């Protein structure tokens, strides 16, 4: 008979794991937004690589609500809406599916089916101007409860009752925007904390933000399976002194056979060899 060697492993690689994805600005900038005016950003049409999210300042929270925080890089999501806003310390626990209060009841309320990850961290150095940075406001005294992902940027004077107040303020009348005091004198729980709530919408339509490719290693001098770049195959991999002119991806011999793959994400001249 004719006994051969069967491919030991199935180590493969892909042309660059991921592309440039905008996981900054809503995650890393200066002035963010305000609770009353939650921002938004529909990231799509890009290979979502959530690895940059982890290599960031020790955060004060990473609670994922519905999705395993370890499988974000492997689930094809349809849309992801990043929402950034700066709240205080005692309000970090209020932003969560099913929790009420006064900063998540009328300012920003998440549904009871919110399949996302809330990310919070301390910002007592970038958004803590002395004497109190009064630029941030938080909405209060809403006529009714808020809805999942509902904006409230009105500034009409609201009163408790039986008090005419249209454009002027008073004792029982106040504007629906109150400043936040960000001073180092204030203890923990009153400092500014930035929160970005990635809302991963899970559906059945073609996903526009899939996770990065599973490019493995480059086991050499050992018979293995191959998917380098996109062609499938099987064989041993050596190191050749050939010089594919800067454009030639695959290689070929005098028999129309794949015989030299180019390191997808390492720009190198490997040479495929037969598994006897």
């Amino acid at each position, epitope marked *: 008979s004719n006994f051969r060697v069967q491919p030991t492993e199935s180590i493969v690689r892909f042309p660059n794991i991921t592309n440039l994805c905008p996981f900054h600005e809503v995650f890393n900038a200066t002035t963010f937004a305000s609770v009353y005016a939650w921002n938004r950003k529909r990231i799509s049409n890009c290979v979502a690589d959530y690895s940059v999210i982890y290599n960031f300042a020790p955060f004060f929270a*990473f*609670k*994922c609500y*519905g*999705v395993s*925080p370890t499988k974000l890089n492997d689930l094809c999501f349809t849309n992801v809406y990043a929402d950034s806003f700066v709240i205080r310390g005692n309000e970090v626990s209020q932003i969560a599916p099913g929790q009420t209060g006064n900063i998540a009841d009328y300012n920003y309320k998440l549904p*009871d089916d919110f399949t996302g990850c809330v990310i919070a961290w301390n910002s007592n150095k970038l958004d803590s101007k002395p004497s109190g940075n009064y630029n941030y406001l938080y909405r209060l005294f809403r006529k009714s409860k808020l809805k999942p992902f509902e904006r409230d940027i009105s500034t009409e004077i609201y009163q408790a009752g039986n008090k005419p107040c249209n454009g002027v303020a008073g004792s029982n009348c106040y504007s629906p925007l109150q400043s936040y005091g960000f001073r180092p004198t204030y203890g923990v729980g009153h400092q500014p904390y930035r929160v970005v709530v990635l809302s991963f919408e899970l559906l059945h339509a073609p996903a526009t933000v899939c996770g990065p490719k599973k490019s493995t290693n480059l086991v050499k001098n050992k018979c293995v399976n191959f998917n380098f770049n996109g062609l499938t195959g099987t064989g041993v991999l050596t190191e050749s002194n050939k010089k594919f002119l800067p454009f030639q991806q695959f290689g070929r011999d005098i028999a129309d056979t794949t015989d030299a793959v180019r390191d997808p994400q390492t720009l190198e001249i490997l040479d495929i060899t037969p598994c006897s």
Partner: antibody
Amino acid sequence: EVRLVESGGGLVQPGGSLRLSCAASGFTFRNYDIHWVRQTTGKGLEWVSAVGTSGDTYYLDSVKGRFTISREDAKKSVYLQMNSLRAGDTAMYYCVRGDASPDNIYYYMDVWGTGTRVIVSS
Amino acid sequence: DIQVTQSPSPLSASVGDRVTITCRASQTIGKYLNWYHQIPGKAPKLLISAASTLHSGVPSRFSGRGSGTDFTLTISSLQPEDFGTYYCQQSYSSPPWTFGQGTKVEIKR
């Protein structure tokens, strides 16, 4: 078939530092996330302090700082080093392979291990 | 947070009975729950995952149920190996994967 050894041992004193290990035997160590559950004799399977292939390293808020997870695919095992331990970390430590369904998200911690043991008295 | 109030601690039982282990959550966790079984002197193992999808190797009428906050492990038939501590685990919690308190199904005389 698919076992998880937990040869770490423990006989530390208050303020010590022991180092555990969980070496798999039967699946892709890479394509799986190894956690670390703990059972006080007279309590309930505790936290996870999970580690991931994307280098994600999770901890509990009441154990953070005095804990450091480390995945090392070279010897197909993970490690769990701890700083000064109080008198509340004396328990049977375990290591599990938390996983969800294909693209579904139901973490079911299915492959449990042996049973490491920690004590902090005389 | 999201707590789980399993059945009262001691659940007497006979080799053949309808055992009801209740797991009620503080919110609507939909269909994110995992049932476990820890026999005294051995490592726990999975029984029901995702509320009703038994994993494998758990076949003794270990039926699950529930799709909101309250879930029930309906054991219709019991064997000597169907006795031990049972735990619930809301998958809707993620970073602090919280388990249950524990319910020991014992034997009756």
